[PDB]
Structures are given as structure tokens and as C-alpha cells.
RNA sequence: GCCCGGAUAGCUCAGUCGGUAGAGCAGGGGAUUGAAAAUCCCCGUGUCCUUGGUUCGAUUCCGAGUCCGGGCACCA
RNA sequence: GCUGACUGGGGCCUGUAGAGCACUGAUAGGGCUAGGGGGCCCACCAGCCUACCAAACCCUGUCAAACUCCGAAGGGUCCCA
RNA sequence: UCGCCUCCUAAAAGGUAACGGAGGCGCCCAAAGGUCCCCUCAGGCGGGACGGAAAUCCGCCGGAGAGCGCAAGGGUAGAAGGGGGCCUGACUGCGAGGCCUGCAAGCCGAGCAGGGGCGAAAGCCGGGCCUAGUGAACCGGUGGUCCCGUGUGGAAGGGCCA
RNA sequence: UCCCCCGUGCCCAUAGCGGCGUGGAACCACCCGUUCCCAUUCCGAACACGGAAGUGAAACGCGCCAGCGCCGAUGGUACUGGGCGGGCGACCGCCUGGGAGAGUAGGUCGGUGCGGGGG
């Protein structure tokens, strides 16, 4: 029973998925610390009461509420309008 | 001094002629030298361990300024050396110093060029401003046949207000540039 | 090359990394010791 | 035979055939078209064959416009082999064709010669075809 | 160009913007967010001496004393294309420091 | 990882028991020859790997950084 | 102990279907045309022509999982019912 | 073929398999790090002695196609790019709070104290434009050290920190 | 409240390119200098200081223009939440909700906040 012989591929890899993205959206209450975006660039630029880590990660600097903002050529900002 | 021949000549002779030739309304529209940047290429100096800081301290006598030590931006194996430590030698002259340099060049140096029939009249081309290049650097007074060792030429770009080379041609010819008609 | 660093004349360690051939020798640098605050540190 | 000169990638996924043609659906060059009535992959060998027949008919005569181009690679595992072990080898190339695509076109010819030539070609194609004229295909102003 | 826009490094309230003209020198204490100018002092445009850097000290002193009154103790020092030098508003007053 | 051995001319290598730098061979000219070798003559090559030091000096003595050469272990 | 699924209204998040050629490549016909091949033809190096290979540019036509100037339906999420 | 990273497949949150398509990693930088101050690309068309078709020089045109050590993607000149000055925060003691998530890992982190660096200052600095360059425990080795020390004092040998 | 300029934000090209006219009394620039502060891998070019003869040429501000760029309906299609049909298959079709992209008409040579100086 004559078995045909076959090859191999040099292909079968991908990396671990890395769960990127926005983590809180407009109008979600947040505490200081809360990370808001996991990103690979300045896909969003940090706004009011928003810091950004060595890895581009945006985060709430206060306990507030999130607002987004497109400024066309200036890009997109995430802010935390504080409640108090 | 704050005044030299050419400088005077420009104002009390050429300035007006041009206003008469081309009919300018404003003092500023009247073309004027901007600068004369002079430069040496120097494909050697790189190699044979060549310090060749001989050229700048020498150049400084003629131009009157300590030149600046320019360097290569890519790596070219083909044409040797690798970006950086590289070589080239460039000085920028404005005001008096510019004038003193041209004064001497036109009135003296171009005279003892080896051949000579006049400066090439195809080295502006619209693109206002004028380029020319030399071979021997001893053609200037300050340089002596004792001082030399290698004959390093140079490029002279002279930049002006003139937007067309018509009106720029006039300016230079009237300042005393002998052109090869 | 892996590398440690000493509050010159005693204890403490900080630990780094030089490139020997590349700019290397006598690695010395102004770092802080918890060993009463703070001095010049050598390699080893 | 009829293939690109380069490709970004050597092999590519098969995909599907939604209706319509997207474009290439109106005349534009010559004075008579051969239009698609069904989707299909058309192989370079078919295109060529048809084209040659066209010419052969009005031998060396008018002009021909081949409006589909086989950019898609066509894989096929070696014969007799079992499954797995990566994608197959590239055997040829196809042009994706969808109903209402004007695949051919002719100029400088009698309607009699044309009508006929095309018919002939329609035979070499593995799909149903229709002949066309130059109606309201003049997308102007 | 003069892009410079180190002012773009404005992260934390109360801009003292400075504009230096060949002739004069002007300066305003600006609130961003509100987009609003509060207090504002000038060279001979506030009617003052025929000098320059010595005038700068005076238009400084002048700005401050006005603002102090309004609460303002502390700010940040601007002039964008400044090259922080010369025409320096080293006034007493303000708690913007330096 | 720890103990050995080494570095000297272009190449392979001798040695004051601290005071001289040398074979051999390759290399270049000259004699021989029907020749190419082997012969026989003359002439070049020295950071004695490295800074320190002992001493009246050092090339061999000692500290030493350095590069190769072994040798015996070890490896959670 | 009413907070659930699911539903209504508001607000963010998105890059598929479709479409498009602005980027990355592929591509038909025509024009113009750097180089190169080759005929005219000579070393005084130019010069003219080409129903040949061929950049960019122009006109007209297309294609794409790893293209996107563009982009639905839907989907995810928080608030209030 | 076996771990890790990029892209697609993946059906517009996340996640998503196959001996599906196609590439990278097992390093590197004492400046390629901190801060302050400056500077702006690739091309294209002229023009210029040696000078190619980019050596260096001049002038226009050129928002980004350059560059950012290295694969890809994202991002980016209103710098993350280039150049210079002082520097060592490539800190020690801590960490509100979150991302991710079967576990254990992985990741971001404001702010407080110590003692610093750059800045007039506002401020910024707990390595590097970002996402690979990695290996739990066990068993040992070094250097430290408030600790334990088999009747007592010390040793031997342990623990603790690195 | 109304002009004009000087600062400084917001909207994010309907703000732009390119053309064409204007403006110097005031602002602003270019300008006059390079002693002094401060500067240049060489240059007072740039940065900086002291000025005020000259110009609005450059740059900036204000107007007009649609050639290019930008924006862009309506209608109709594509695609599709959900409901259901035909074909042997590739795929096609009807319902009810949603509804592009290209393209046609058309529009655009900006709008606005605060503060200052001048009628």
C-alpha cells in the first residue's frame, strides 16, 4: 500500500497575543492608578489628569470620569474630568 | 576698516547703474551680495593617517577666518571612509570680510590663474547666485611657493538678492567680474 | 560581561554590565549606598 | 505564459465570489465586448486560448483588449499525496471573474467577423458569455 | 523655524507668557483650560523709560505687584523663544521662583 | 573554577646562574655549472609580548596586565 | 436582596462586509519619455530614427488575507430605565 | 517541529485552531543612559577644481516617503530623530491603584522618605520610541550581616541581605 | 458696542497651494551697530545686547480670484441586524429594520474666545 512522501513548512509560529486596547471608555468612573489604554504608540495622547508610562500606557492621575477627544491633526486625548 | 573699495564701488557706482538698467522702485529690491561661502573637497586626509590640518590654518590667512571642519554623512566603501571622522573644509564670509576677500580675488588672484579668458558665464542659471571652482591655492598673494606642498583647489559660491540671473549677472560683471563673453 | 560595584573601601553592591573591548577599564561611577549615604563605587 | 512579473507574496488564500463585478463592467475601448454571466476563476491558459482563436479568426486583423489579468496563484499538492504538511505548490494563475465583467473587447472589425470571433472565444471559456455593443456605457456628463 | 514650543511643556498651571519686540517687551499671566488672560504688563506700551533690559526689570516689578493684589502668588515662566537671558524679568514678588 | 608550561629576526626556536642577543631555515647578491637542487662566500631583519620594581646597569630576578599552549577537576 | 439574561435611550471603543487606489505592490490600452538594446554610422562624438526592452509624468481601464484616502450592518463597554 | 517577538489567517472589543501564509529573538549601548540648550529629514531640479550615478559646497522645491542598533507592526519632526553641556535616577527604603490572569508568572504605576543629578525656574530622572534578547524550585559558590550557635565562652556549621 | 494692529488660546484644510492689491501714523518686522551681556564645529547668518537714520523689498497683516488642493448633499445602488426562500454546487432571490464607498449637483481662498495698544 504505497504511501506518498511529504515535506515540511517553515512557518508555524505567531507570538503570544498581548491584549492591547482601551480599557475604560467615556463616562466610566475611575480611581487614580486605573490604566485606561494599553497601546503600542501614541494612538491616544494623554490629557487632563492622565499620565503615560515607559510603554505608552495611559492612566488616571485622579479619581474622576473619563472623556475622549479628537483634535484632528493634534490627535486623540483621553482626560479624566474629576468629580469632587 | 568698516569701508573697502568694492564696498564703496557697490554703493557709489553699481547700486545706481542697476537702478537705471532694471528700474527698481525700492532700495531693497536692488540686488546685493548676501554671502560668499568657500569650500574645499579633500578626498584624501582621511587616509595615510593624514591630519592635514595644514589646509585650514593656511586658508585662514587668505580668507581671514578660521575655517570649519566638515564631515561625511553616509558611508561609501566604493569611495572610501565611513560617516564621521571624515573630511572637508568650509568657511562662510559676510560683510567687510566678504568684501576684502572678493576685492583681492578679482583685483589680484584671478590675474595669476594659469590660463584664463574670463569666468564661465553659465554658473548661475536662474537659480540666482554664482559658483566657480579653482585648482591652485597659491594664486592668492598671502600664499607663497615655499608654504605649499599639495595644490588644493576650492569651490566659490557667491549668493545674492537677485531672483533672476539676468540682474545677478549685471551685478557681478559691474563689480568687476571678467566674464568669458 | 556581568559586573558588581563596591562603595569604594567596604561592602555594598549594585551590579551592571560593561563591554570590555568596547570602552572598558576600571569602571567607576557615583552611585548611592544604603551604607551611610553616598560614594564612588568600582567594578569586580 | 501570462503572470505577474513580481508578487508581494508567493501563495495566497482561496476566498470567495460575492456577486457583481465591482468595475470593468462597461465597454471603454473596442466596439464589441464579451461579457461574463457567472462568476469563476479563469485560467491564463483559457484566456490565451480564446485570445488566439479571436486573432486566428480575423487573422492578424483588428485589435484585441484582454481586460482580466491572472494575478492570483493556483496551488495544488503533488499527486497521490495525503493531507497536511503546509500549503501546496503553485501550479498556475487565475483571473477572478464575476457576472458583468467585460473580459474581452474588439475594434476595427465588421460586426459579422466580431460576433463570430467572440462566440468562438466564449467556447474556450468555462463559463457562459454574452456579447455587447456600446450603449449607455458612456459614464460622462 | 522657531518652533521651539517648550511652552508645549505646560503641565501645571499659570503661564507667564513673554513677548519681546525689537522695540518693546510685553507679558501676560495666562490661564489655559479657561483660555483667558488675567493680568498684563508692557514696555513703553505701559508708558515707561527709553531703555531696554533695565525697562524689563520695571515691567516685571509692575506685572507682579498688579497680580499679587488679585491672589496670584505663583506661576510658571515662559517666553517660548526666550533663550532665557538678557531682558530678564528677575522681579521680586511672584512665587513662580527664579 | 584551580595548578602547570610558554612569548625572543619573516618562520621554528637556543642562552649571562643580573654584564653577548644567537643558531637553523626562508629570504637577497656572488663562485660553480649542460642544469634544478645540495654545495661554498657576503649582507637585512631585536619594544627579548607589558608596565612597575631589586640593583651599578638588565635580555634571564621578583610583583604583574596580556595572549596562546596544555593539565585536573565541577556543573544545580 | 433586584443587582440577572434580554430590552429602550444616551455616551465612548472598533477597521470586517462593501468600496477605493491616497500609501505598498500587481496590472490593460494609449501618449510623453531618463537610461539600455539595435539600425543609420563615425570615432571629429556627436547625431537621426526605431509597428523593440523600459523608469517617472499624463489620459483611459483594472487587482490584493499579510494594501487603505474611505467605511456600514453589527459587536464590546459604562450610565439611567 | 518544541520557548519567546511581529504580521496575516481572526468574521471592525478581547480571545480564537490547523504539519495554514511569512519573518525575527537567545544579542546590543559606559553612551545608544539622566537633565538642560540648541538643530530638522529622504528625495528632486539647477549651479560648483580635483570630483561616480549620492564624498564635501551653494540655491530653490520637498510635511514626512528619512531616521529612530536589529524582525515586523504601531507610533513619531508641535520628536521618539541629529548636535552639544553638566551628569550617573542603569538610585536606596516604599507603593494608593490597576492591566493581565486557572496557578505561578508578566506589565504599568501616581505619590511619600533618604541622599543626588540637570534646570533661573515650572519641573524631569527608579535605564534605553514601544512590543523579543529568557529559565520556577532544589543543590552549591562569592561579599556582606541586628540573627542561631546542642551545659558555658568561642569556634564548626546554619539563617538574613546581595 | 464699531474699526486696525500686537500678543494668546479653541475649532481642525470650508483654515491650504498658487496667483494678484494693498498696509508703515501706530504697532511689527526688516533695519543701524557689535562697546557691553551673550553667541558661531567658520560666520553678529542664527542666538544676544545697545540703538533708532531708512523700508515696507523680504517676512507678517488685510483684501480679491476656483487653476490645483480641501469639503460635499439629494437620489439610487453595494453591503448587512433579524425574519424566510431557489439551486446539485459556485452562488442566487423575497420580507422588515440599518445603510455606505465612489460619483452628480454644490460649497470653500476660514470661524471664534480672552487680554492688551491705537480712531
> What percent of chain E is helix, strand and coil (3-state, nearest 5)?
25, 20, 55
Determine the length of chain C: 44
Q: Contact A36/A58 with Cβ under 8 angstroms? A: yes
C-alpha to C-alpha distance for E89 and E54, rounded to whole angstroms: 10
C-alpha to C-alpha distance for B29 and E69, rounded to whole angstroms: 52
C-alpha to C-alpha distance for C12 and E57, rounded to whole angstroms: 52
H or E element: which one contains D47? helix D44-57
Q: Which residues are bridge partners to C3 per DSSP?
A: C16
Beta strands in D22-81 (DSSP E): 32-36, 40-43, 63-64, 72-76
H or E element: which one contains E61? helix E53-69
Contact partners, residue A56, CB within 8 Å, separation at least 6: A39, A40, A41, A42, A43
Q: How far apart are the two ends of chain A, measured CA to CA in Å? A: 81
Largest CA distance in chain A: 81
Nucleic strand H near CB of residue B168 (< 7 Å): no
Q: Contact B70/B56 with Cβ under 8 angstroms? A: no
Chain A 23-62, CB < 7 Å to strand H: 23, 31-35, 38-43, 51, 53-57, 59, 61
Interface list for chain A against chain D, based on CB atoms closer than 8 Å? 2-9, 11
From the list B76, B79, B55, the residue with the least C-alpha distance to B143 is B55
Nucleotide nearest to A70 (CA to C1'): I12
Reading the block at residue D4, the C-alpha cell is 505577474
Q: How far apart are the two ends of chain E, measured CA to CA in Å? A: 28
Specify the residue for cell string 571612509: B81
Reading the block at residue B79, the C-alpha cell is 569611495
Q: Which domains does chain D have, with CATH numbers?
A: 29-137 (3.90.1170.10)
Searching chain A, which residue's CA lies closest to the CA of residue D79?
A: A4
From the list D50, D39, D55, the residue with the least C-alpha distance to D113 is D55
C-alpha to C-alpha distance for A24 and B74, rounded to whole angstroms: 47
C-alpha to C-alpha distance for B31 and B168, rounded to whole angstroms: 7
C-alpha to C-alpha distance for B85 and B81, rounded to whole angstroms: 8
Chain A residues near residue D84 by CB distance under 8 angstroms: 6
From the list C11, C3, C15, C16, the residue with the least C-alpha distance to C34 is C11
Q: CB distance A11–D85 less than 8 Å? A: no
How big is chain C by its Cα radius of gyration, in Å?
Answer: 11
Specify the residue for cell string 495666562: E30
Structure obtained using = X-ray
B172 SS3 class: helix
Q: What DSSP character marks residue D107?
A: E
Kindly write down the DSSP assignment for every residue of B13-47, as one continuous string. IIHHHHHHHH--SSTTTS--EEEEEEEE--SSSSS
Kindly write down the DSSP assignment for every residue of B92-132, as one continuous string. EE-HHHHHHHHHHIIIIIGGGSSS-S-B-S-S--SSSSEEE
Amino acid at each position: 500500500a504505497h504511501k506518498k512522501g511529504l515535506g515540511s513548512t517553515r512557518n508555524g509560529r505567531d507570538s503570544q497575543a498581548k491584549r492591547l486596547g482601551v480599557k475604560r471608555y467615556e463616562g466610566q468612573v475611575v480611581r487614580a492608578g486605573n490604566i485606561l489604554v494599553r497601546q503600542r504608540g501614541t494612538r491616544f495622547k494623554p490629557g487632563k489628569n492622565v499620565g503615560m508610562g515607559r510603554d505608552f500606557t495611559l492612566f488616571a492621575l485622579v479619581d474622576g470620569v473619563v472623556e475622549f477627544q479628537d483634535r484632528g491633526r493634534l490627535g486623540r486625548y483621553v482626560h479624566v474630568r474629576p468629580l469632587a | 576698516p568698516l569701508d573697502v573699495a568694492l564696498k564703496r564701488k557697490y554703493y557709489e557706482e553699481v547700486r545706481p547703474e542697476l537702478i537705471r538698467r532694471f528700474g527698481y522702485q525700492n532700495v531693497w529690491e536692488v540686488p546685493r551680495l548676501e554671502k560668499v561661502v568657500i569650500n574645499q573637497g579633500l578626498g584624501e586626509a582621511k587616509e595615510d593617517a593624514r591630519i592635514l590640518e595644514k589646509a585650514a590654518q593656511e586658508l585662514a590667512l587668505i580668507t581671514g577666518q578660521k575655517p570649519a571642519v566638515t564631515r561625511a554623512k553616509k558611508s561609501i566603501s566604493n569611495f572610501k571612509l565611513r560617516k564621521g571622522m571624515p573630511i572637508g573644509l568650509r568657511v562662510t564670509l559676510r560683510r567687510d570680510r566678504m568684501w576684502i576677500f572678493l576685492e583681492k580675488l578679482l583685483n589680484v588672484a584671478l590675474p595669476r590663474i594659469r590660463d584664463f579668458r574670463g569666468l564661465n558665464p553659465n554658473s548661475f542659471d536662474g537659480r540666482g547666485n554664482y559658483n566657480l571652482g579653482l585648482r591652485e591655492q597659491l594664486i592668492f598673494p598671502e600664499i607663497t611657493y615655499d608654504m605649499v606642498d599639495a595644490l588644493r583647489g576650492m569651490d566659490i559660491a557667491v549668493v545674492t538678492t537677485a531672483e533672476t540671473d539676468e540682474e545677478a549677472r549685471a551685478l557681478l560683471e559691474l563689480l568687476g567680474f571678467p566674464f568669458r563673453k | 560581561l556581568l559586573l558588581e560595584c563596591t562603595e569604594c573601601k567596604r561592602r555594598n553592591y549594585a551590579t551592571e554590565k560593561n563591554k570590555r573591548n568596547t570602552p572598558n577599564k576600571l569602571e567607576l561611577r557615583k552611585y548611592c549606598p544604603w551604607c551611610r549615604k553616598h560614594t564612588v563605587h568600582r567594578e569586580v | 505564459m501570462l503572470m505577474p512579473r513580481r508578487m508581494k507574496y508567493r501563495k495566497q488564500q482561496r476566498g470567495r465570489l460575492k456577486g457583481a463585478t465591482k468595475g470593468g463592467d462597461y465597454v471603454a475601448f473596442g466596439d464589441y465586448g464579451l461579457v461574463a454571466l457567472e462568476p469563476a476563476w479563469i485560467t491564463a491558459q483559457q484566456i490565451e486560448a480564446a485570445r488566439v482563436a479571436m486573432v486566428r479568426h480575423f487573422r492578424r486583423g483588428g485589435k484585441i483588449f484582454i481586460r482580466i489579468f491572472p494575478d492570483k496563484p493556483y496551488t495544488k499538492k503533488p499527486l497521490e499525496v495525503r493531507m497536511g504538511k503546509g500549503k501546496g505548490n503553485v501550479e498556475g494563475y487565475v483571473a477572478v471573474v464575476k457576472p458583468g465583467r467585460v473580459m474581452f473587447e474588439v475594434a476595427g472589425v465588421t460586426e459579422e467577423q466580431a460576433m463570430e470571433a467572440l462566440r468562438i472565444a466564449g467556447h474556450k471559456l468555462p463559463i457562459k458569455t454574452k456579447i455587447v455593443r456600446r450603449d449607455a456605457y458612456d459614464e460622462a456628463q | 523655524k522657531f518652533r521651539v514650543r517648550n511652552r508645549i511643556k505646560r503641565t501645571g498651571r499659570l503661564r507667564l507668557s513673554v513677548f519681546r519686540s525689537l522695540k518693546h517687551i510685553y507679558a501676560q499671566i495666562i490661564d489655559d483650560e479657561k483660555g483667558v488672560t488675567l493680568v498684563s504688563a508692557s514696555s513703553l506700551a505701559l508708558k515707561l523709560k527709553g531703555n531696554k533690559t533695565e525697562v524689563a526689570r520695571q515691567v516685571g516689578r509692575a506685572l507682579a505687584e498688579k497680580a499679587l493684589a488679585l491672589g496670584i502668588k505663583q506661576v510658571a515662566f515662559d517666553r517660548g523663544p526666550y533663550k532665557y537671558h538678557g531682558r530678564v524679568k528677575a522681579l521680586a514678588e511672584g512665587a513662580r521662583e527664579g
